[PDB]
């Protein structure tokens, strides 16, 4: 029913402005400095990062914006993926 | 949790004899006094009038015939600021000019008035004046607990100048008063390094050192040493702040001989003997030329006393029980003994022109016959 | 009324002695795995010493074959021989000539008689120096008749003839 639950959130915090800073052609170094460290990286396959801002305040939906930018062998960046919402509830 | 006494003891009272007949002419009080605190409140004397002092407040003015008052004014501020302002007087009560320029602990040197006891002026000084003031050409001087030989204009207290010295972390209340010698004063030091200065500008000309290493290696510099030295004919006898006797000149201030034995407590110069006591009640006699043990009486050993004084062919020393002990210059057994106070004796029995006096703990005076 | 064991056996259970084998991942094509951090790795080894309660743990002895201990001297052979007779033990052949000899079964006695063996010894004693040879290469050691001469066995009963001759000198 409706009893109680402490709020649940998962790391890699985000704003809605700095995500206008990062750009193509930048470095792993520049990006890592800009947005902090990617808490959830691609353990295998190609190197690729996953910045996910997911949050559950408990019994009131679940908010999550995620952005998992691509990369390149040389350690440079190629593409990004702006997922602001979670389709599917 | 309060039953933990343990210490070494002392010889109680060897062989009282009666080769003299000691009596107490008169004993006025000035009230406490000194209690048990350590100080130098020896009462001085002139013009057949003594001038005692106390711990906190009053002074007096007692005639030196039976101990009758001339004026007994307090000194602490009338309207008690915190509580009647215990002035904590701890300076040697000297006098000169018109004037018992008493020392203090509140960093004050009250220049009083022999006439009636009205402050000619107060004055603040760096640190406390644990020493005894000494007049020298209208220039008093004060050794402090901050090593500052701040001289002062006599009539006003106009601070002529100061000179800084050093001091270790832990010391004793060694507070050498200077001694005049052709403007060239001289003092000891809690450091252990006698200096030599000039008044008119406050400038030192020379430095020395006496004893071995101390500080976590505490040397026998602890001493009832009359940190105030003496000088004769251009040579000094600065019985060391330690006590390791040394003889030195004025200009160079160089070692003439080193009787490096113990820790001095006083000295007296007459002819050739140097009577004194060394750190353990050990009354000795030494010659001018060098460290020369004329003899050694050690009766009262470990039973602490006060610094001695000559008196018409009879050295005398105080005690911790109100006893007097009279001794011939020839070693050195007692020539008599009295028991004149109960509280005890702490300070130096000063004497002059026949009149021998001393302050008790509190019931100060005892005009000895 | 409980003895003869609990003393040369490791304490505890023996469940660990049967853990599952470490099969290896399993690794589909077109992909890598994050095995890239081998530091808890296990190096292979043939062995093969016994395990479990069968494994001896009895603390090692010394005065493993003769981690030698000597102390230079005058001569020793003319008296170390009778240093034997300090115990009056057997001989297979006395040899004053080579200044050494070899003996027959010698039976020590611990608190474990089955473990206590009658044993044969090659007494190695000469002054080779500047050197005083107190060592013996085990000759014949059997499990009270069952001939076994592996390391701990060969190490231990060596140490007996080791010291009981120093103790044979300290007279």
């Amino acid at each position: 029913r409706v009893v109680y639950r402490p709020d649940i959130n998962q790391g890699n915090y985000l704003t809605a402005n700095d995500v206008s800073k990062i750009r193509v052609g930048m470095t792993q170094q520049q990006v890592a400095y800009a947005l902090g460290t990617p808490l959830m990286s691609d353990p295998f396959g190609t190197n690729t990062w996953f910045y996910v801002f997911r949050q559950q305040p408990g019994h009131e939906g679940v908010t999550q914006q995620t952005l998992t930018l691509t990369f390149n062998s040389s350690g440079v960046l190629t593409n990004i993926d702006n997922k602001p919402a979670l389709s599917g509830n | 949790f309060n039953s933990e006494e343990d210490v070494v003891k002392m010889s109680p009272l060897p062989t009282v004899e009666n080769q003299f007949t000691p009596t107490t002419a008169w004993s006025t009080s000035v009230g406490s006094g000194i209690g048990n605190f350590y100080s130098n409140l020896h009462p001085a004397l002139a013009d057949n009038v003594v001038y005692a002092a106390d711990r906190a407040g009053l002074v007096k003015a007692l005639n030196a015939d039976d101990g009758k008052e001339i004026w007994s004014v307090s000194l602490a501020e009338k309207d008690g600021w915190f509580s009647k302002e215990p002035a904590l007087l701890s300076g040697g009560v000297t006098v000169s000019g018109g004037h018992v320029y008493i020392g203090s602990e509140k960093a004050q040197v009250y220049a009083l008035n022999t006439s009636d006891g009205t402050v000619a002026w107060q004055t603040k000084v760096a640190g406390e004046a644990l020493s005894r003031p000494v007049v020298s050409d209208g220039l008093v001087l004060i050794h402090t607990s901050n090593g500052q030989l701040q001289a002062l204009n006599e009539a006003d207290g106009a601070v002529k100048w100061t000179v800084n010295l050093d001091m270790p972390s832990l010391s004793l209340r060694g507070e050498s008063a200077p001694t005049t010698a052709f403007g060239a004063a001289v003092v000891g030091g809690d450091n252990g390094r006698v200096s030599a200065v000039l008044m008119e500008q406050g400038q030192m000309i020379w430095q020395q050192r006496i004893s071995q290493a101390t500080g976590s290696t505490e040397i026998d510099r602890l001493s009832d040493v009359d940190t105030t030295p003496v000088v004769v004919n251009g040579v000094v006898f600065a019985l060391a702040y330690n006590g390791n006797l040394t003889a030195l000149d004025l200009r160079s201030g160089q070692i003439m001989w080193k009787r490096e034995l113990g820790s001095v407590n006083d000295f007296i110069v007459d002819g050739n003997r140097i009577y004194l006591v060394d750190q353990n009640d050990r009354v000795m006699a030494l010659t001018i030329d060098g460290g020369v043990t004329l003899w050694t009486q050690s009766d009262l050993l470990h039973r602490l006393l006060t610094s001695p004084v000559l008196y018409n062919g009879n050295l005398v020393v105080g005690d911790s029980e109100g006893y007097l002990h009279w001794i011939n210059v020839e070693d050195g057994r007692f020539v008599a003994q009295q028991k004149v106070d109960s509280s005890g004796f702490q300070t130096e029995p000063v004497a002059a022109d026949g009149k021998l006096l001393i302050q008790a703990k509190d019931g100060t005076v005892y005009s000895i016959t | 009324s409980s003895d003869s064991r609990y003393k040369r056996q490791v304490s505890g259970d023996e469940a660990y002695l049967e853990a599952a084998p470490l099969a290896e991942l399993h690794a589909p094509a077109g992909m890598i795995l994050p095995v890239t951090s081998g530091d808890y790795a296990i190096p292979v080894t043939n062995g093969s010493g016994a395990v479990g309660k069968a494994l001896d743990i009895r603390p090692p002895a010394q005065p493993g074959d003769t981690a030698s201990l000597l102390v230079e001297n005058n001569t020793l052979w003319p008296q170390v021989v009778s240093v034997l007779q300090a115990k009056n033990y057997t001989i297979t052949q006395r040899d004053d000539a080579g200044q050494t000899l070899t003996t027959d079964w010698v039976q020590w006695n611990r608190l474990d008689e089955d473990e206590q063996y009658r044993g044969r010894y090659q007494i190695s004693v000469k002054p080779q120096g500047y050197q005083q040879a107190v060592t013996v290469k085990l000759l014949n050691l059997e499990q009270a008749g069952k001939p076994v001469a592996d390391a701990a066995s060969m190490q231990r009963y060596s140490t007996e003839m080791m010291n009981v001759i120093s103790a044979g000198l300290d007279k």
Binding site: - | - | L25, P28, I57, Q62, L111
Partner: protein
């Protein structure tokens, strides 16, 4: 405790130990060490000391004496024994709660002891290939590895029950980075799969699915 020169009393300690009674020999032995810090074989007494400590549950002091002997004179023809003994100390220290007799699984408690034990045995093995204590060391190694894997898997299970679906992925990645052979990993994989499923990250789920299908 009476007093003598060291020889006879040390032999007495020998007797009262070989019997089996510990604490008496313990006393005599630490004595012979103390009253003669550099006696006949003043380290022999140390080895016997640690052996008795172990056989008498004196775990912490055993540990301490082990360290002291090691750092006192590391190179020593028998030190491998001491390595192995330290390993036993850690291991037996781990599951010490005999309550497990009731039938519970210890595999979820503090693992730190297992970690020290594993480090020790590893150092022993790679430092001495053909010593007397290699095999049993290896067996214990394997078992400890499995234990650690199981522990981390427990944690991951708890989280995936909670919901924290980035903690799950991180923990599983860590295991898969460190214990990539035990049963625990081949068992936990579906957890990572489901996690990736949750956060609408699919291609990742397909990767882990190909993995899990390759077994």
């Amino acid at each position: 405790v009476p007093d003598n020169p060291p020889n006879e009393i040390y032999a007495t300690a020998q007797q009262k130990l070989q019997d089996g009674n510990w604490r008496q020999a313990i006393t005599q032995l630490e004595a012979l060490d103390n009253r003669y810090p550099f006696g006949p074989y003043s380290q022999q007494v140390q080895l016997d000391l640690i052996y008795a400590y172990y056989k008498n549950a004196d775990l912490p002091l055993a540990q301490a004496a082990i360290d002291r002997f090691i750092r006192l004179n590391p190179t020593h023809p028998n030190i491998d024994y001491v390595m192995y003994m330290r390993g036993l100390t850690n291991m037996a220290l781990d599951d010490s709660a005999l309550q497990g007799f009731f039938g519970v699984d210890r595999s979820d408690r503090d693992p730190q002891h297992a970690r020290a034990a594993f480090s020790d045995f590893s150092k022993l093995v790679r430092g001495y290939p053909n010593s007397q204590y290699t095999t049993d060391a290896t067996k214990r190694l394997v078992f400890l590895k499995d234990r650690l894997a199981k522990y981390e898997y427990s944690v991951a299970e708890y989280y995936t029950e909670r919901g924290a679906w980035v903690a799950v992925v991180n923990r599983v990645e860590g295991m898969l980075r460190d214990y990539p052979d035990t049963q625990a990993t081949r068992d936990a994989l579906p957890l990572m799969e489901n996690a990736y499923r949750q956060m609408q990250m699919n291609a990742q789920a397909e990767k882990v699915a190909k993995i899990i299908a390759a077994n």
